[PDB]
Design a protein around this nucleic acid. Structure first.
Lengths: 107, 93, 82, 98, 391, 86, 95, 107, 93, 394
DNA sequence: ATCGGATGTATATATCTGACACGTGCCTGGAGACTAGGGAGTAATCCCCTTGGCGGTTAAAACGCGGGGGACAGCGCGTACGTGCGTTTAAGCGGTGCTAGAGCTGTCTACGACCAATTGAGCGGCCTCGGCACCGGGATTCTCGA
DNA sequence: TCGAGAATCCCGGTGCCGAGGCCGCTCAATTGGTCGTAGACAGCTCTAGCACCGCTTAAACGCACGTACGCGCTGTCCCCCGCGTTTTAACCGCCAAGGGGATTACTCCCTAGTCTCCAGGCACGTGTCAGATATATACATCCGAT
């Protein structure tokens, strides 16, 4: 009987097998349900896909085909929900969103 | 010595979302740290949920509740959709 | 070997640049010394925890992880160094 | 007559410039010495991975830059456009650093 | 200097509107008592028609002065006018616009025009697998609204449920349904509009970007495809449905293209297409086709293989100055004024025969075409519309 | 079989009560616009804490929000509370 | 009659000296249940739960007013204003 | 045969044995060292003493013999270090330290 | 159903520091919550330390380093002092 | 009305200072060529002395005008004056004070006084097990400094290494060593001064508080004990070393008392004591003692057991108007002017005998006491100081 | 700056209640004592990367000199917030009664841990090339004294 | 408002190296069993959450009033920006040592797991004393008058 990755059974790109192990060896609980790693791997792929899709756009908008830290930054900080999920995180070489206070603009 | 990563999985997802787009080493590192971060958060919260309720098993239920607690607004909703989706499909095969 | 007065390395033009990226348009001369002091404190806090990790590992070399774990411990998570 | 820009014009130009770019604004070597100097008071004869020093500078600049954003709002709050020491102090206090 | 496209000129050849096929929802414009024609019939009420555009269930007509008359199914607002009074949609009537129009385009449930000042006004709505999406995120537009407000445009092209826009800067914008990749600017996970942003990105005119490619100078759109021609290199870029090679090129392992790909199309005068076939007209006035052969929509006679590479229609001996397509039928207009048609005749769109499928180009000579100089031919869902030069 | 729907209870947070709070905060003079602005802030605060509290409740398959649910919710948001459990 | 501000300072001292809750308990309880409606219908509460919320809430507000107060004083005023609360929360990362 | 608590061997009041169990069944590591519980219980006992002493003094200063939340709050918020350790903790019925901004005072 | 707490231990400590001083139930609760909190912080950090260094045992060393990280200034110095004494005295009994 | 105490009245009876015992560090104040005196000897240089106070290795003297003269070991600044000149510490000299004093007190390494305006000035330093501590948290104080600044005081008492202060409001303050519980206001884990706050709580005059108890009206101190009298109830509260029942009451299985306890002491005129014994003077002018019997410091004679309950000294039949103590010896001054002494004579502090320990109170009749009026008596570590009534009485 | 009137607030005392402290019976969690496995201590290795010198190029720091514009004090106007008093609202408290649902218990089923033999996914190492940095020069845009 | 000047955007060509795809090669995930208990479940106990009646009165509300405060506007000046010139020393490329990070190979000893045993710590009763409460009063502070 040939082997099928648990990832493929769930139709996932992220490793249900690897995730399942990290949970067991991760000092989280005495036991890990069969559905836990599948559910977690699925959620990780989703968030990964979300950031990448936005970063991709950011790269195109600058005539680049290669995603660099700066794009990851723009994608995250321009998304209300991602910015909040990563509100205490710092992205190296990410930079800052252009923002000049109105009172500072010439009058 | 073998040091595992999420690189290949992050790249697979990248090819599904932007087939003609690449990623720099530093960007892949950042993506790799992000996955581990989210992993620890979710697993950590799921860990406590089991403890609080005197359970010794981390099931899909804890993962789901952990997601609802940690992810803002729509992210959580869609993340739960994807989570449930996968588990359902996995139960089939 | 011994290090001294390296905080003067953080110069006026370097500080005002950081401010520019922060959106600052006009800067009081007193700001520069104030910033050096703030920076020293910040570095002291992070480096202290970093070294604590370093000593626990029984190492004489501060690794990138030591700095990363330290920053995370203080709610200043950093991506792009492991 | 000579050509000079009005005070603030070049300033904004610098703001737009550095907000667009993502390179470190502090001098590498001077900063690496500051790190080593500060580290002396914790452990004698410390060695640093190159990346460890970089990770510190990244975190330091990101910290200071953001702090200036808050320092800026405080100056503006007092109907000023010039950030002052008391502005940095208020921001840090509100944050919980003081 | 800087890349800048000129505003297009409105057609100047005066003609008479002709129709044929089913007119249940009033797409024949012959009133609400006439539900079918088998030969080309004249439409009454339109002064100085110069250009035509056939949607799925409706029609648009541009006049000498730049006025737009419309008729057909206004269930979604595709007529951009008040259809309250009975039979007001079965006969042509004027559309209220801020100015005069240069170009017109029509989809299955939407319409659009290009004003003389470079504004792109549109109305009706687009439709995906779920149903009504609306023209904007707000919903339907029973009356015209500026879609590219602030931007000056020089060209428009409509598919079944998507709109393609070209700016004077050479930038291309798309909007509408994206489930076939006709927008050429969305990932598979977002084409369905089921993301955290919903249909906000499908219904907001967003630029179609091809990294490191020159500004585009021309656009074309079939039912589920979008075509572009980037300046300098003259390469034709295509995106959208391709399950039958509607893109005249191959998509490795995919049933469609979500982002534009290079095609080997050369010297394109015009591109038309139905659902599963694309008709290509070159500048040397030769007509070629691609797609599935069923019902003879390719006009290549007895062919049973899906034509993947642009095959030239041999049966057409004369020079072709215009081509057109219905969902499953094609048209060609010769330089001398003749009109050829072929494909499914089951809806009497061919204007020749008795509902039988024409496997190859057949000339159309009836009381309203014989001896007359044909100009334009465009097909819709179950009908067809034409413009015949006047005296 | 009585389905009570509550409305406009944010006005239960009176001006006097808000003044008292500000007083304990060391505030001496208060603008009239403060009182309404404060009600909005309190609402957001409660929405955030209660949401998570209820999330814990539903997980435990309970109909009643327990003190621990609130305690855990607060801790999650970096506002640990002593004197109710945990 | 005491001069404007004199009684205010007296209030400040009184409440900084005590620990009792400053918001009416019942009105607050309804506010809690009302806000909770939008998550789960017919929710029940333990009294200690509602109380734990009031403790947290009032501790949160009191502290917010302290920061607000510093913003007012900063702008050379002694009267807290909405702008002051908004600045405080912004720097806190609540906005 | 004659048993003796591990706490007494370490001269501690806090339960070395209970702490050891809590550590094992707390999902922290596959295994727990013999000295870990002793060290931890000692640290917990020390911190408890440090705060209870300052608190006790607070009750005494207000003419009370029983410690209440207020005395705990006073003990903590007045000790720079303890304040930091509990900078994100809220003590129920603890109130606040008397602090009126200088400018707010009259003259 | 018996529920345990550090109640009795906190009292024993209280009687050593202030023999003539008592404590209210609410104050004792707060004290119990404090011990549980500090416990979790220290154990959690020690847990991470053992993990970061690819070790599967939480020893007095992880506890000490955890304390050094968690406790401010002199609090840590004296805490480490106390932890050392206890372990020393214990290993000789 | 509000509880308020009056500033004490300086003694007015003029007299001459006497000394006896070892004077190695100049605590005899008789120059640097006299190291021992077996009989009470006069001390020249001090005009119109009215009150005395013996420390461990030094002495303080108060004059009718309020001036203070000191002499003895000044290695810690206990003298409060420039000991620069050669052999200037072995002779009585003036102290520079912001006024005139009402009361004086001295310990092993420190001295204190209560000025005529209610201020408490102190100098020298305190000393715990870890060596020197300093007067304030800063360190020693060679020159006198105000200790209770901005506070009106009315009484002071000194132990070996702790200072006790009474405010006009009836508030008690203690400062100095605490390892025996003489401060009465610290936990067992903080008395050694090894907490996070170091010794800041020992070296800052902090109030002694007995929860729910009336203001105090009087204070006394032995070497390692502090005594108080609660107003109204008239109860005597005691705290400090008690390994020999120095407190006169029992401390359940403890060698000391960290916080004040109720004693069954009644009618107290004055309390004195050495290291391991306390001498009690009642209002009916009788003398009682507690402590350890060794070397007959209790003056009861052939006592073999530790005296736990205040036992009245039998051989003392006359009325006593004053009592005093050295580290291991005791004194009694009769209403008529006689002087008794007992305890360890190994340091020739008794003024009578040849170094022999006196188990029972023996009257001191020598050249300088024969037919004279004795007023005060207080002993130190190796010496003793007295005050004889002069024939001037201006 | 001095003083009395008027209000608040701290303080002494006497009584009463209820929560704290201590007692006890019980059980179940920790201490003993023992064996067996495998984490970690320890020694010794390989070689990475940290550190530090020379010396050239030049980016960037430092310095100084106008002078424009913003910080700051002053001050004059009027709105708005505090203070206090009298009216009004519902909070607070207690008392009663119901039942939802938290909590517990004994089942017994279903799931997850575990192990061993297998093998393909995923890692490290190695080119190879095309994305992008780098540059130079001309198109366009934004600022500023008339 | 105008054109002069300086900055930024942009277009195309050239060269460099990092990213992306391949290829053995392990070793981690898979399969396919078995065993044991966590937890699903159903019944049952009874806490406590809820809700109304009705009295008392604390607190909210409303209104009038006066001042002291926010705020806008003017004047003063020093201080920070802008720009040009000199100066420092960062930056980089090269060379080279060797500290110490990372590794491996062995074997000890420390920790999990158990079963028995029994006393530490729990629940729960029970009584008294700390403190809540009330009141009369002395004391501290504010404020107007002079």
């Amino acid at each position: 009987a040939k082997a099928k990755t648990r990832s493929s059974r769930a139709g996932l790109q992220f490793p249900v097998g690897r995730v399942h192990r990290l949970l067991r060896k991760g000092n989280y609980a005495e036991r890990v349900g069969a559905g836990a790693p599948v559910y977690l791997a699925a959620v990780l792929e989703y968030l990964t896909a979300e950031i990448l899709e936005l970063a991709g756009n950011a790269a195109r908008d600058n005539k680049k085909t290669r995603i660099i830290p700066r794009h990851l930054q723009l994608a995250v900080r321009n998304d209300e929900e991602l910015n909040k999920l990563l509100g205490r995180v710092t992205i190296a070489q990410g930079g800052v969103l252009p923002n000049i206070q109105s009172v500072l603009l010439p009058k | 010595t073998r040091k595992e990563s999420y690189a290949i999985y992050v790249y697979k997802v990248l090819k599904q979302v932007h087939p003609d787009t690449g990623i720099s080493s530093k960007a892949m590192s950042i993506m790799n740290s992000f996955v581990n971060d989210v992993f620890e958060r979710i697993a950590g919260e799921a860990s406590r949920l089991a403890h609080y309720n005197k359970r010794s098993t981390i099931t899909s239920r804890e993962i789901q509740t952990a997601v609802r607690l940690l992810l803002p607004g729509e992210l959580a909703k869609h993340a739960v959709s994807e989570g449930t989706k996968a588990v359902t499909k996995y139960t089939s095969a | 070997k011994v290090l001294r007065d390296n905080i003067q390395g953080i110069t006026k033009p370097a500080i005002r640049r950081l401010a520019r990226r922060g959106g600052v348009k006009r800067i009081s001369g007193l700001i520069y010394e104030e910033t050096r002091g703030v920076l020293k404190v910040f570095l002291e806090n992070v480096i202290r925890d970093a070294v604590t990790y370093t000593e626990h590992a029984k190492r004489k070399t501060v690794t990138a992880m030591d700095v990363v774990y330290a920053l995370k411990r203080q709610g200043r998570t950093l991506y792009g160094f492991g | 007559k000579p050509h000079r820009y009005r005070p603030g014009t070049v300033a904004l130009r610098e703001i737009r410039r550095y907000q667009k770019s993502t390179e470190l604004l502090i001098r590498k070597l001077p900063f690496q010495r500051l790190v080593r100097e500060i580290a002396q008071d914790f452990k004698t004869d410390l060695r640093f991975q190159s990346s460890a020093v970089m990770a510190l500078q990244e975190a330091s600049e990101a910290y200071l830059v953001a702090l200036f954003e808050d320092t800026n709002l405080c100056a503006i709050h007092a109907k000023r456009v010039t950030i002052m020491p008391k502005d940095i102090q208020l921001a840090r206090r509100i944050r919980g650093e003081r | 200097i800087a890349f800048h496209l000129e505003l297009p000129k409105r057609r100047t050849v005066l003609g008479n509107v002709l129709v044929c096929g089913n007119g249940d929802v009033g797409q024949l414009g012959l009133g609400e008592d006439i539900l079918e024609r088998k030969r080309l019939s004249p439409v009454a009420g339109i002064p100085d028609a110069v250009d035509i555009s056939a949607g799925g269930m409706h029609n648009l007509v541009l006049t000498k002065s730049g006025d737009i008359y419309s008729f057909g199914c206004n269930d979604e607002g595709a007529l951009g006018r008040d259809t309250s009074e009975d039979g007001s949609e079965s006969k042509p009537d004027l559309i209220d616009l801020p100015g005069k129009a240069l170009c017109i385009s029509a989809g299955d449930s939407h319409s659009a025009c290009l004003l003389e000042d470079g504004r792109v006004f549109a109305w009706g709505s687009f439709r995906d697998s779920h149903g009504n999406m609306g023209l904007t995120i707000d919903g339907n537009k029973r009356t015209p609204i500026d879609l590219m407000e602030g931007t000056v445009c020089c060209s428009i092209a409509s598919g079944a449920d998507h709109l393609v826009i070209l700016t004077t800067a050479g930038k291309v914008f798309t909007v509408g349904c994206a489930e076939q990749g006709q927008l050429g600017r969305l990932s598979e996970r977002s084409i369905s509009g089921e993301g955290r942003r919903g249909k906000r990105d499908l219904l907001r005119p967003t630029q179609l970007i091809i990294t490191r490619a020159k500004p585009f100078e021309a656009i074309w759109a079939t039912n589920y495809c979008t075509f572009m021609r980037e300046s300098q290199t003259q390469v034709i870029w295509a995106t959208g449905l391709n399950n039958f090679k509607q893109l005249a090129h191959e998509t490795k392992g995919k049933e469609f293209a979500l982002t534009p790909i290079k095609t080997e199309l050369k010297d394109i005068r015009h591109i038309a297409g139905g659902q599963h076939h694309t008709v290509i007209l070159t500048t040397d006035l030769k007509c070629s086709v691609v797609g599935r052969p069923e019902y003879g929509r390719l006009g290549l006679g007895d062919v049973k293989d899906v034509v993947e590479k642009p095959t030239i229609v041999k049966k057409l001996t004369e020079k072709i100055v215009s081509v057109g397509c219905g969902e499953v039928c094609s048209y060609a207009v010769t330089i001398d004024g003749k009109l050829y048609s072929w494909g499914s005749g089951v809806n009497n769109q061919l204007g020749v025969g008795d509902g039988d499928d024409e496997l190859e180009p057949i000339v159309v000579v009836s009381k309203n075409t014989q001896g007359k100089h044909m100009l334009l031919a465009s097909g819709g869902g179950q009908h067809a519309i034409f413009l015949v030069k006047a005296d």
